[model samples]
Target: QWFCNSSDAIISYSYCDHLKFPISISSEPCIRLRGTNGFVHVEFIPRGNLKYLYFNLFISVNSIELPKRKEVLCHGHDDDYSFCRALKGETVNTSIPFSFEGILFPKGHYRCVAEAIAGDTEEKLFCLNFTIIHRR
Candidate 1:
C-alpha cells in the first residue's frame, strides 16, 4: 500500500505572512507525494541572493509528534537537485522526485511544519504549515 494516496488524502497549506520574508511561494504551498515516480512541483521567488538554504521539517499525527523531524540542506556543490543556486530577485521553478514506496499510513489528521532558513545569515526565511488528512 502507498503511504499516501490522492483518493483518500487531502492536504492544505499556508505560509507565514506576518513578516517580510525573503522567499515567496508562487505555487500552492500544499505538497503531495505519491508512492513512486511522483514529482513535487514548486515555484518560489527569492528577494535576495540565496547562496545557501536549509529546511527543517516536523510531522505529527493527531497532535502527537512523530519521529520524523529532519533537516535538509541544499548545497551549492549538488550535482542536479540544487534549488539553492538561485539569484537575487528571481523566480525558481523546480520539481523534485519522490521515490519512497510500499509503506502504509493510518487514518488520521497529519500536521506538518516546515521552516526555511538562510544558511549564510542563519535567519528564518519563512514558516509553512500543512495539514493532511487520510480518510481511509
Candidate 2:
C-alpha cells in the first residue's frame, strides 16, 4: 500500500481546506484545530487503470489501537461518495469535504489515516497520514 496527501490543511470552524498533493517521502498532512468537530476537504485521483476502491478515514491515538478501533470517522462508500465503487475520472476534480467529530477521540495528538483499497485482496493504494491535536 502507498499513500497520498494534501500539502497541508487549514483547520477552521467546521471546515478543513486542503491543497491536494501526491505523497512524497515522509509527507505530513498535519492539521491544527481548537474544536472537536469540523469538515475535512480532500480529493481523489485515479492511479493507472484502477477502478474499484475502498476509502476509510479515521483517527488513532495511543489509547486506541487495531481491533480496538473498529470504526472510522467516515466511509467513502457510504458517506458523501455513496458509490459502492467510484469510477475513475468520475469524482469532484478539486476536493471533497467531509465531517469529523472528536467526541469519540481522546485528548492528545492522533494519527489520521485515509486509506484507499480495492478487490478482495484488500490491496490498499494509499494511506494518507495526517496529524491532529485534541486538547481536552
Candidate 3:
C-alpha cells in the first residue's frame, strides 16, 4: 500500500522573457509505502508558446545528484509529436497523474526534471523540479 502526505507547494523553476523564475522546494505529496506497490504523479503548467517538452525523473538515497541525470521515464508528444500547443503568454496545464501499471518504484527520495523548448529558437525555455519520498 502507498500513501501521500501533502506538505507544501514547490516551484522548481520558471522563466519568462529571459527572466528566471524563483523556485521553492517542499515535501508535499510525499509517498510512503506499506506494500511493494508505489508510484508518483506530477503536473506541469506552461506559460508561453510551447515548442517542445521533455522530462526525466531521478531517485537517490540522500541528496539530489550534481548535474542530476536520470532515465527518461516519460516524454511529451504524441505519434505526431505535436499533440499539445501553448499560446504566447498563455498558461497551459499538463500532468502525469500516476506511474504506468506494472512498474514498481523503489523506496528513496525522487525528483523530476521538466524542460520546455522555445517555439521561436527551439532553445530550452523552462525547467522545473519536484520531489517524491518513498518508504517501506
Candidate 4:
C-alpha cells in the first residue's frame, strides 16, 4: 500500500498571487492523484523562454512541521510533461506526475507549502499552499 489511499485522499489549494508569473491550475481542483500516483494539471504563460525550474516543498503532518523537505528540479527531462522550454506568449499546459510511493508517510491531516522558481532568473514562478486529508 502507498502512503496515502488514493480513494480517500483530497487536497485544497490556493495560489500565492504576490509571486511573479501568471499561472493557472485546474479549476475543478488544483491537483489530482491516485494512491501515490497522479498528475498536476496546470497552465501558465512564461515570462520568457523557460529552460529549467526549481521546486521547493515543505511538508507538515497535522500541525507540526516535518524536518524533511523536498527540493526538485524540472529540466524537461524524461516524463516531466512540458515543464520547460516554452515561449513567453504561449501558454504552457502541463500534467506533471508525482510519485509518492515507497516512502513512509503516516496517514494524517497533512499540509504542503510549495514554491516554484525560474532556474536561471531566480524569479518566483508560482507558490501555493495545499492541505491534504487522508482517511484511514
Candidate 5:
C-alpha cells in the first residue's frame, strides 16, 4: 500500500507496504507516516499458524542499499521494541514508530522494509518507498 500528501508546503510525503510469506500462508501488510516532525509508523498483519515471528525493520535513503542490499541506515527488531506476536488462530499485527530526532532527514526518497521469519521458514514480507521534499 502507498499514500501521498502534498497539502503541506514544507514537506512532501508518501509511504509503501511490503510483505512476504511462506508457501503455507499469506500475509497482509500496511504502513503510514504521520505527526508534525516526520515520525514513521509501520503496521503489519500476518495470518497462519506461525509458532514464532521475527521481523527486521530497516530504513534507507536508497532502497538498493537496504540491509540485504547493503543499504541500511538504521535497523531494529520488533521483538525488542514492541508487541511482536499473534494469538492462537488470530491474525498478527505489529508496529514500528520512530522519530527523526534533532537531525533533518533531508529532501529525498526513502525506503522501509520488513523481513519476517516463521518457524524455520523465512521471507522478505514487506518493502515500501516514499519521498520527502522540503518546501522553502
Candidate 6:
C-alpha cells in the first residue's frame, strides 16, 4: 500500500473491512525513483473494540521480510491498560508519523514494511519501497 504525492511517499490503513477502506495506494507498494527524495509516512487506525496493536518495521531486499535487520520505529498508545483509549474512533484519526533520511539502492526492488500485530493474527499495514535509477 504505497504511492507518492506533493510530499513523501505515502501509506495508510484504517478501520473497516477490506472494501470499506479508503482507496489511497495500490495494494502493491513501490517507490520508483529517478529523483525521489523525502520522508515516507505511514499510520494505522484501529476499529471495532480493538485495544491496541504493535508495528514492526523492516527493510526487504525483495518481498521477504528481514527480521534480523528490522527496527522498531514507534509505539503510540492511548493510555493505561483499562483506563482511556487512543485513536478515538472511525471518525477520529490518531497515528504515528515518522521520517527517515533518503537512501540509495540499485534499480530493482527494495521495500520497507510496517507489519501491525494485534494478536496471534496480524496484518501488514504499510509497505514503503524504492526502485532506484538515474534521474533521466
Q: Residue 109, candidate 2: how far off, in angstroms? A: 1.6
What is the lDDT of every predicted structure here?
0.61, 0.41, 0.40, 0.62, 0.38, 0.37
Candidate 3: stretches off by over 4 Å: 1-47, 56-83, 94-98, 102-105
Model 6 segments more than 4 A misplaced: 5-45, 48-52, 62-65, 68-84, 87-89, 94-97, 104-108, 119-136
Error of 3 at 3 (Å): 13
Shift of residue 63 alpha carbon in model 2, Å: 6.4
Clashes of 2: 0
Clashing pairs in 4: 6-35
The sequence of per-residue lDDT tens digits that candidate 6 reaches over residues 46-99 is 442233445455656546557744433222354333211433244323322223
Per-model TM against the reference: 0.72, 0.45, 0.43, 0.69, 0.42, 0.39
Predicted candidate 1 versus true structure: per-residue lDDT over 30-133, tens digit per residue: 33333445566667776544667777787787888876455655655663556678866678777766554523655578788787767777776677776777
* Model 2 agreement with the true structure over 76-129: per-residue lDDT tens digits: 334544433445444423223433332443355455566655544455545565
Candidate 3 contains a number of clashing pairs equal to 1
By the TM-score metric, which is better: model 3 or model 5? 3
Task: State which candidate has the highest lDDT.
Answer: 4
Model 5: CA > 4 A from native? 4-44, 48-52, 56-82, 87-89, 93-97, 124-136
What TM-score does prediction 3 earn? 0.43
* Per-model RMSD to reference: 5.2, 8.9, 7.5, 5.5, 7.9, 7.6
How much does candidate 1 score in TM-score?
0.72
Model 3, residue 42: what's the lDDT?
32
- The local distance difference test score of model 1 is 0.61
Task: Please give the ranking of all candidate structures by lDDT, highest first, separated by commas.
Answer: 4, 1, 2, 3, 5, 6
> How displaced is residue 104 in candidate 5, in Å?
2.8
